């Protein structure tokens, strides 16, 4: 039944298969099982109990997958924190989750030392030399608690961009996870001995298909390492070397791999299932991928972290005359899904409305906030075609998407505002897709170099939320009501650029 039990079922049937691979190391189900059991002894020796929070802040590794599974078994709540994100943002997530343990590398100890969570216990996963190395914790005088865990118990929290600059914790249960896993396993017919690439970092929910679907069916998950993120040819090499059958990423990555990594010239015969999510896929490029890989299964999976995948569309043949992205399709993960008019009523075929999700994947709620009650409103505008498939039209709020990344205007704005020589800030995106750029429009106290500002951003935000371009104004356009005129601001940034293509 429960998440940790799916590994245990796989162990019994396949103890000698490779479970988890990283850039340095790999583990069989048996070796994973012993590593897990050793992390369980360690969490118990440390006094970390059911429902308490632990932070994972380190590059993806077989030890992280073991720690996740150790926490599940003790119903300890694990919080994957972006390892490419600075200590100041971990302090906010540490504050919000009120976590009692950090699991990091020995390199990260120095950052933690000066930080606000200096007084939180850390243990080193990587360097045996480090006084904080996890094996140095004595577990002899320690015992595994007697406890049971129900499908609705909090398993992990995936933090997301916060409009106030404090990130929000999507608190998710065994049942949330498993309704996705079981849905995907049945839908794409995942087999023992299949090899799953884990492209996404652990704090995104793409990673939950890669790791938990793999461990569910006695297959292998290969952690794509951070080091090869910007290298489309190393990414296609990873597919070849690990004989990858199942790939799951944002289309931006597949498109890098198609342009600068020979994915269409050097066919990867091992790929059986190609899953993409998180943003639209320019249909001209998706038509190419479909043609190269005629035999492969292609699907467009849709939803926020708060629902995981709530909708999906099987991409068969694509009309050559088609110009729009393919549908986001029909309900998934055993959810019911509908478009709402702003009054409450169901939209009818052809009527744009906001997508609503009722089902077993809908989050418990943002951690340390009031529970999700009833269906979840996604903020995503959609429209049903006659055949029953939804198309995504966009958002009406301050959640930006740059190449699949989710960025609250306010989180970047709060960072820029904290700059001593910045009195007003407003963030927006110029361009679509691969071209898209994140802009800061600032007013200076005493008239701000881009390099200085990037330095300033990088100390507070993940690099994917560091602004590409800056525009300094004497004041920000306002609306009658005093609020910043984001429509005016967009027109003025679009206008200044249009004047530079003319001059």
């Amino acid at each position: 039944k429960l998440l940790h039990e799916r590994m245990m079922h796989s162990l019994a049937r396949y103890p000698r298969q490779t479970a988890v691979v990283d850039e340095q190391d790999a583990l069989s189900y048996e070796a994973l099982e012993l590593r897990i059991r050793e992390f369980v002894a360690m969490l118990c020796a440390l006094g970390v109990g059911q429902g308490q929070r632990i932070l994972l802040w380190a590059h993806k590794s077989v030890d992280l997958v073991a720690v996740m599974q150790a926490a599940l078994r003790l119903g300890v709540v694990y919080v994957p924190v972006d390892p490419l994100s600075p200590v100041s943002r971990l302090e906010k997530i540490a504050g919000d989750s009120q976590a009692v343990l950090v699991l990091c590398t020995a390199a990260r100890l120095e950052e933690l030392a000066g930080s606000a969570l200096a007084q939180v216990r850390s243990v080193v996963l990587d360097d045996p030399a480090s006084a904080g190395y996890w094996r140095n914790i004595d577990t002899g005088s320690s015992v595994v608690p007697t406890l049971a865990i129900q499908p609705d118990d909090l398993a992990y929290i995936l933090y997301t961009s916060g409009s106030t600059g404090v990130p929000k914790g999507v608190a998710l249960s065994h049942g949330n996870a498993l309704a996705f896993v079981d849905w995907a396993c049945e839908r794409y017919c995942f087999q023992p001995g299949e090899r799953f690439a884990n492209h996404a970092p652990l704090h995104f929910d793409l990673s939950v298909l890669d790791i938990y679907c793999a461990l569910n069916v006695g297959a292998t998950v290969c952690l794509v390492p951070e080091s090869i993120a910007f290298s489309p040819r190393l990414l296609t090499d990873f597919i070849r070397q690990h004989e990858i059958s199942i790939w799951y990423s944002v289309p931006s990555v597949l498109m890098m791999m198609m342009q600068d990594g020979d994915l269409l010239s050097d066919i990867q015969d091992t790929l059986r299932v190609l899953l993409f999510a998180g943003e639209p896929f320019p249909v001209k490029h998706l038509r190419d991928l479909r043609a190269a890989y005629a035999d492969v299964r292609l699907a467009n999976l849709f939803g926020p972290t708060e629902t995981n995948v709530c909708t999906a569309f099987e991409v068969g043949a694509i009309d050559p005359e088609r110009v729009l992205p393919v549908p986001i399709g029909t309900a998934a993960s055993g959810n019911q899904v509908w478009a709402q008019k702003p009054d409450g009523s169901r939209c009818a075929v052809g009527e744009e409305g906001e997508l609503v999700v009722q089902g077993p994947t809908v989050m418990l709620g943002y951690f340390a906030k009031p529970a999700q009650e009833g269906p979840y409103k996604t903020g995503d505008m959609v429209r049903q075609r006659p055949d029953g498939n939804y198309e995504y039209l966009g958002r009406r709020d301050d959640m930006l998407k740059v190449r699949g990344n989710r960025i609250e205007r306010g989180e970047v704005e709060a960072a820029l505002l904290a700059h001593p020589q910045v009195s007003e800030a407003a963030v927006l995106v110029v361009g679509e897709g691969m071209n898209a750029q994140l802009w800061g429009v600032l007013v200076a106290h005493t008239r701000l170099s881009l390099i200085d500002l990037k330095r300033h951003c990088a100390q507070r935000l993940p690099r994917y939320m560091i602004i590409d371009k800056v525009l300094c104004l004497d004041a920000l356009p306002r609306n009658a009501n005093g609020k910043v005129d984001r429509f005016a601001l967009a027109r003025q940034v679009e206008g200044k650029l249009a004047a530079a293509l003319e001059h």
Partner: protein, 75 residues
């Protein structure tokens, strides 16, 4: 060397983005990224050819690191 380093520093500063130091971490501060790094290579080939095993922190960390990389590509 110092000429190779300045044709780059000029390009970064002009055609992609003050002063940009030798050691200014180009990836940490998202000056170089998934979309602009392949452009800078278009240029370093088409007007000075970096291999795809090399598109990583080791090669493109600092300005002087991108300097060493082209310098060491002799024959």
């Amino acid at each position: 060397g110092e000429e190779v380093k300045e044709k780059i520093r000029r390009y970064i500063m002009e055609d992609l983005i003050d002063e940009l130091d030798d050691q200014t971490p180009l990836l940490e501060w998202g000056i170089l990224n998934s979309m602009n790094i392949v452009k800078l290579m278009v240029y370093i080939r088409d007007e000075m050819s970096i291999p795809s095993t090399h598109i990583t922190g080791k090669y493109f960390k600092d300005l002087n690191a991108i300097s060493r990389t082209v310098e060491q590509l002799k024959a």
